[PDB]
Amino acid sequence: DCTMYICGDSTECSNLLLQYGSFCTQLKRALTGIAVEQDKNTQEVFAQV
Amino acid sequence: DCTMYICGDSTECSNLLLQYGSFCTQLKRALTGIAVEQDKNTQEVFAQVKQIYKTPPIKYFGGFNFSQILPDPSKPSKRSFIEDLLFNKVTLADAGFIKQYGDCLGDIAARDLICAQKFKGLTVLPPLLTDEMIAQYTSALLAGTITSGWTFGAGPALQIPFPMQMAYRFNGIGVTQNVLYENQKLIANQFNSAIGKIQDSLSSTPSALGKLQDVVNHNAQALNTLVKQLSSKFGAISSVLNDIFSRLDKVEAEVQIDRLITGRLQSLQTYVTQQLIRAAEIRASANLAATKMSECVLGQSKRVDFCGKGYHLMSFPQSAPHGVVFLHVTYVPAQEKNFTTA
Amino acid sequence: SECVLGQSKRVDFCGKGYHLMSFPQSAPHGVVFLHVTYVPAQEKNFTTAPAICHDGKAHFPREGVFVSNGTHWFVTQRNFYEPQIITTDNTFVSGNCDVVIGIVNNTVYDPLQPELDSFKEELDKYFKNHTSP
Amino acid sequence: ETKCTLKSFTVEKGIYQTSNFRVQPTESIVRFPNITNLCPFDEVFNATRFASVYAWNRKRISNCVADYSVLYNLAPFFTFKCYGVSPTKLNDLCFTNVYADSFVIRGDEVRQIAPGQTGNIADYNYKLPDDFTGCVIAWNSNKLDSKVSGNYNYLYRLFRKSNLKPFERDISTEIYQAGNKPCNGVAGFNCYFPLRSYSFRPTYGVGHQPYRVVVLSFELLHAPATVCGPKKSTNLVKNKCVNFNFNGLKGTGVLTESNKKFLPFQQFGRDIADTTDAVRDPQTLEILDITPCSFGGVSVITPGTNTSNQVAVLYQGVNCTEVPVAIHADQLTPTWRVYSTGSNVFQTRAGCLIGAEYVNNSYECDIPIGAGICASYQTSQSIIAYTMSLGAENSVAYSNNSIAIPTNFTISVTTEILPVSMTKTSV
Ligand SMILES: *[C@@H]1O[C@H](CO)[C@@H](O[C@@H]2O[C@H](CO)[C@@H](O)[C@H](O)[C@H]2NC(C)=O)[C@H](O)[C@H]1NC(C)=O
Ligand SMILES: *[C@@H]1O[C@H](CO)[C@@H](O[C@@H]2O[C@H](CO)[C@@H](O)[C@H](O)[C@H]2NC(C)=O)[C@H](O)[C@H]1NC(C)=O
Ligand SMILES: *[C@@H]1O[C@H](CO)[C@@H](O[C@@H]2O[C@H](CO)[C@@H](O)[C@H](O)[C@H]2NC(C)=O)[C@H](O)[C@H]1NC(C)=O
Ligand SMILES: *[C@@H]1O[C@H](CO)[C@@H](O[C@@H]2O[C@H](CO)[C@@H](O)[C@H](O)[C@H]2NC(C)=O)[C@H](O)[C@H]1NC(C)=O
Ligand SMILES: *[C@@H]1O[C@H](CO)[C@@H](O[C@@H]2O[C@H](CO)[C@@H](O)[C@H](O)[C@H]2NC(C)=O)[C@H](O)[C@H]1NC(C)=O
Ligand SMILES: *[C@@H]1O[C@H](CO)[C@@H](O)[C@H](O)[C@H]1NC(C)=O
Ligand SMILES: *[C@@H]1O[C@H](CO)[C@@H](O)[C@H](O)[C@H]1NC(C)=O
Ligand SMILES: *[C@@H]1O[C@H](CO)[C@@H](O)[C@H](O)[C@H]1NC(C)=O
Ligand SMILES: *[C@@H]1O[C@H](CO)[C@@H](O)[C@H](O)[C@H]1NC(C)=O
Ligand SMILES: *[C@@H]1O[C@H](CO)[C@@H](O)[C@H](O)[C@H]1NC(C)=O
Ligand SMILES: *[C@@H]1O[C@H](CO)[C@@H](O)[C@H](O)[C@H]1NC(C)=O
């Protein structure tokens, strides 16, 4: 999660983190991509029938 | 371009960037490496022949219709209609070498096209191989594999008629060849109906060419995020540097501009690392494609489930924007009867 | 594990063209493979037919091809020119000869037929020593 | 240039990318509001009676010329405490409004004026915001304001129910209640008069003299400004590179006419990249479009230093009718324009190349260029750029009754090289 690890349970830290743009959005995109291809690995290796 | 992207239109910023060191020089070296390797991939995939073979004018392949995949003389280019369908279906291709400076000043809608986001030193370079020569390579491969048997990957090309060529292909599966000589018309009609249904299926759905669309979509998304990320304040006073130079003195503003420059180089290096990872993945996929090109076409693969579902008979290559499309012609057993064995 | 310890049937994997074997050599941070490969030399052209029918019955080879020099017909392996009289090792009959296209006529001399024609030529002469006179 | 960027004297045969080119500007333009009267700061700074800490006076100043050059000696400005904007370059910025808030405070607690300092004069009387832009001037007033009988005129506060948000003022004075008993009355348990008079005479301790203080506040990049520096105007230039300075916005490029329509309060135009592109001139009210001049990468194609020094120069993706605009004197940042007055120039798909010549015959590729174009060092010696040869065309006759069978063979030996282990390391 973008907010929890860095500026969790604090409003002002999230406010100053809002300036940085789409860093953790790119982080979430990369992690969701590796998750979906991680599922795709098992789907490719175990669904030959 | 590091100087324009990080320290555009400021002499003192360029001096302070030259003071930092050899960062963007290393970045440029890595980008030349990725570009040269990327040209090398397309070079080594399609250079499996040394002579550009000419297709014969005779189009009677023993009752086997083939006009879908051979090049069309009526077209000004040497493109087959299947290749044209593949090319115009993915209508998001490269346009980085088309927009010249007149197109930049064309003022379409306040210059909101890609020229606005390529003003910040980002440049797309055209590939060495053009479309017509790639199509010529594919036509040469198809011409070699259609008449000269499969021996043309082992030196010289020896002409073999199509009938006993397919008979040998049956002999390399487990069924004796003679049966092909009683089922010639039926097998030809099945081949023609199947090759028509391929074009029908490609023209049917719009969710079949995702495997090439995702690459260019990811590339465009990476560039868009890079050009969008410049609006970040990075803890400075303003996101524009000339205001900082014209507002604060040169004995306190160096800290803020230092933070801004370090943040922008951090984002640039993150982009470079992501590009390296995608390059490694594309390199592995291209090597696998080269193996498929060498084994499933220039010969018949005894491995099961490597050149198509079922027992593989033969194959066809076709070009595509940043990609290759294989047509695997394969054998599938039909309905069965059970008896008593011993 | 694949090229050195056995012959590879995968084309263009352990050398250009047909593959025979490979030898390894060491190098500073690397290995050097010496592949020994077999490549066909200059060729010759012939006229071919897909099958042959003699007694109203088709015949086929299970490896090789029928080739003609304009006068006689021979069976030949694919990757080396060697004409030969018809072989039982490449002759089997599957149906009559009115359905296939491109077939010609010739006497058939696969050693099954020399069992009556020429392999028992001494026995044929022994049989004809009594019937003919 | 390629020896400088490759750090080696002997460069190998090939193509090398080098430093990009740029189009130098020609002159500079400044366009400011043209007002005649000076800003009336004299009656603010030389008022006979100033204001109290709880009732500071606030004046907005507009429609004049910000001229602080005469404000250097006169109104000597003992404090250089300006941190939001550097006071030396104050005249180079344009402010949409300026507000002067003045009062008289105890001379000891000057530093309580700065933001973030707590207490009673900075909490219960007046406080600055967190992101405040502007600065304060503080100086001593002992000869004028302070009397031998005591300047008993300015009233300070020492208590409030809660801390007040900044930029807020109160007028009401009520006897306090600080308990369960509603002590309204006239006096009692913490029932005192709110604002108390000063006790300042010059015979007191050092730093206890009354001080005159005045804070100046202003906001930037909001609206077309009405008060800024005395810089003269000039003439507008169309479709030519120039260093423009609009209201402190300094940039370099060309200015064209745009067909977009603004709003009466809108002044600046933005884009997705957070860069100004469309501006409206303060004097004449049309729409101006900003665009920096073109540039691009530079590549050099050379044979080895073992061979001759004849090179070729390629420009990255530029229209070749626009590169003669780059061919002038004192026009380009790369000073090596000696080759810019060169030879015949031939256009490819990624720019146009100077120093070679097309040949319609085809050779094998040696140097990558792009779009199937390849360069070589060949015939007299020169550099030739030609179309890449895909190979030798060889028709093969298809037959339905013939066969090609090899009669001889050969055995050959091929080498392969594979890396197996890169060198280990540790740090
Ligand atoms: C080979 O296939 C092509 C494509 O199916 C055939 O071209 C079509 O032929 C039919 C009738 O012969 C026409 O009605 C279509 O208009 C043709 N299509 C196009 C795109 O022109 C071709 O005739 C076939 N040739 C042989 C010898 O079977
Ligand atoms: C062979 O397959 C058939 C059908 O899958 C099995 O069913 C028997 O054969 C036919 C149906 O095709 C019926 O007439 C019989 O009554 C079926 N049952 C039996 C018990 O013979 C059959 O079992 C399979 N095996 C054999 C050896 O025939
Ligand atoms: C800059 O000064 C000029 C000269 O005073 C102003 O020009 C006036 O307005 C228009 C053009 O803007 C001229 O045609 C008038 O003749 C001028 N009138 C007067 C009384 O000078 C111009 O408005 C000034 N620009 C700004 C932004 O104040
Ligand atoms: C504006 O006036 C209101 C009164 O209506 C102030 O609110 C009071 O704040 C004190 C602070 O402790 C409370 O004890 C009172 O109960 C509040 N009044 C009411 C009616 O709730 C408010 O503080 C004033 N604004 C400022 C900035 O001081
Ligand atoms: C296949 O080609 C080889 C290579 O030329 C032939 O070997 C030559 O044979 C002649 C005949 O005695 C010799 O004079 C040459 O010296 C041989 N060449 C070499 C390099 O040793 C070989 O004879 C050919 N095979 C056939 C069946 O013609
Ligand atoms: C056999 O092949 C050769 C190869 O070029 C050709 O010249 C010749 O005409 C062919 N013979 C026949 C009968 O087609
Ligand atoms: C303001 O007062 C100071 C000191 O009283 C004086 O030096 C200055 O001239 C005055 N300003 C003007 C404009 O007269
Ligand atoms: C230039 O190259 C040649 C061979 O290509 C070589 O013999 C010669 O020594 C080289 N020149 C120098 C100065 O090394
Ligand atoms: C430059 O633009 C013009 C537009 O009229 C075009 O004709 C010309 O080919 C372009 N130059 C190059 C080198 O592409
Ligand atoms: C190449 O072709 C062009 C266009 O036809 C012509 O102008 C030029 O002279 C030709 N050059 C040669 C060497 O044939
Ligand atoms: C072989 O092909 C030719 C055309 O190239 C054709 O005229 C001829 O009929 C074909 N022969 C057979 C036996 O099909």
From Swiss-Prot, chain B:
Effect of D214N: In strain: Delta/B.1.617.2, Mu/B.1.621
Disulfide bonds: C2-C24, C7-C13, C104-C115, C296-C307
Glycosylation sites: N65, N338
Region feature (Heptad repeat 1): 184-234
Positions of region (Disordered): 92-117
Effect annotated for changing T123N: In strain: Lambda/C.37
Region of interest: Fusion peptide 2: 99-119
Any coiled-coil regions, as ranges: 213-257
Region annotated Fusion peptide 1, chain positions: 80-101
Annotated site residue numbers, Cleavage: R79, S80
Substitution effect: F152L: In strain: Eta/B.1.525
Function (record text): Precursor of the fusion protein processed in the biosynthesis of the S protein and the formation of virus particle. Mediates fusion of the virion and cellular membranes by functioning as a class I viral fusion protein. Contains two viral fusion peptides that are unmasked after cleavage. The S2/S2' cleavage occurs during virus entry at the cell membrane by host TMPRSS2 or during endocytosis by host CSTL.
Record's protein name: Spike protein S2
Organism for this UniProt entry: Severe acute respiratory syndrome coronavirus 2 (2019-nCoV)
Included range, full protein: 737 to 1078 of 1273
